[PDB]
């Protein structure tokens, strides 16, 4: 059953990035007030707000370091700033004045997957989330030239909009890799504990298969309902480690009680989705599927 993978908005007809006034963002957030904050500390603070036109936005205010360039601002502007797809967060505008660098996303109703999955998601709903987030990443790797390597896929960087559909976000660490290359050399260790592929700890090189590892983790989170690290059941392990040792024993215990409880006849489909996740988490990068294959695994499971 023949599927055309990418058929999202044609850029040429898209609303261009609006350059915004700092004063407007300043006012709309009440002087960047604390009760407007929705995200704190990581490379900036993110504030919920409604613009002059009624549009609900999230405004990321990037922290300016003395004697430094705006690398993270540019990373988003040169990547998510240039593309649109239903499984990517919409970057609506930006503010660049003096040393201020702000990024204005369309506001995604339910905030991040992490926020939701821990503090209502049924299977059908979670299935849709894994699929859409796979499509978003696939777009970055396969439908962009040069390719985009996200470098920080995690459940907090998967937003959920009105109809609970997945939107990959936070492009601050993203990098462009020529299609002729297989990897990009980076200067430092970047990524979130729980999600870093093994090879990133051996060599300062990122690649699309790097992103694919991190995706696998996000999929575990959906299947298990666990955080990627620091859960009491884990012990000396992470989510990845835990699922690994745990499975020789009783595989289906790994699954989230809430999904199992909803229906005992989805225990098989759940198991099949775990195969995808495990493939993505292969220690050998070359053996991991591309995100295009992951999507194909998903749609095979259904039929």
């Amino acid at each position: 059953d023949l599927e055309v993978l990418f058929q999202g908005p044609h850029m040429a007809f898209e609303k261009p990035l609006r350059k915004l006034t700092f004063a407007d963002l300043l006012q709309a957030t009440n002087g960047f007030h604390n009760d407007s904050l929705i995200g704190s500390g990581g490379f900036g603070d993110v504030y919920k707000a409604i613009l002059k036109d009624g549009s609900a936005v999230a405004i990321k205010k990037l922290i300016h370091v003395s004697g430094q360039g705006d690398r993270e601002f540019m990373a988003e502007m040169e990547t998510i700033g240039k593309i649109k797809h239903r499984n990517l967060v919409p970057l609506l505008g930006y503010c660049k004045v003096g040393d201020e660098r702000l990024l204005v996303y369309e506001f995604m109703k339910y905030g991040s997957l992490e926020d939701v999955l821990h503090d209502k998601l049924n299977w059908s709903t979670r299935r849709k989330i894994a699929i859409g987030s796979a499509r978003g990443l696939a777009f970055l790797h396969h439908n962009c030239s040069p390719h985009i390597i996200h470098r920080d896929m995690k459940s907090s960087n998967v937003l959920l909009d009105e109809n609970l559909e997945a939107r990959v976000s936070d492009f601050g660490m993203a990098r462009l890799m020529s299609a002729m290359d297989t990897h990009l050399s980076v200067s430092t260790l970047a990524g979130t504990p729980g999600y870093v592929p093994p090879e990133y700890y051996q060599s300062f090189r990122c690649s699309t298969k790097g992103d694919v590892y991190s995706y696998g983790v996000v999929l575990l989170e959906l299947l298990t309902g666990k955080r990627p690290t620091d859960s009491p059941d884990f012990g000396d392990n992470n989510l990845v480690g835990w699922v690994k040792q745990h499975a020789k024993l009783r595989i289906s215990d790994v699954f989230d009680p809430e999904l199992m409880k909803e229906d005992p006849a989805l225990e098989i489909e759940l198991l099949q989705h775990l195969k995808v996740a495990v493939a993505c988490l292969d220690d050998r990068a070359w053996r991991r599927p591309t995100m295009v294959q992951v999507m194909a695994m998903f749609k095979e499971i259904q039929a």
Binding site: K248, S252, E267, L271, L274, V278, L281
Partner: peptide, 16 residues
């Protein structure tokens, strides 16, 4: 390890 795990999961669907 991983492929052992993959086998385990295949048993599980079969062992349903």
């Amino acid at each position: 390890t991983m492929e052992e795990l993959q086998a385990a999961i295949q048993a599980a669907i079969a062992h349903c």
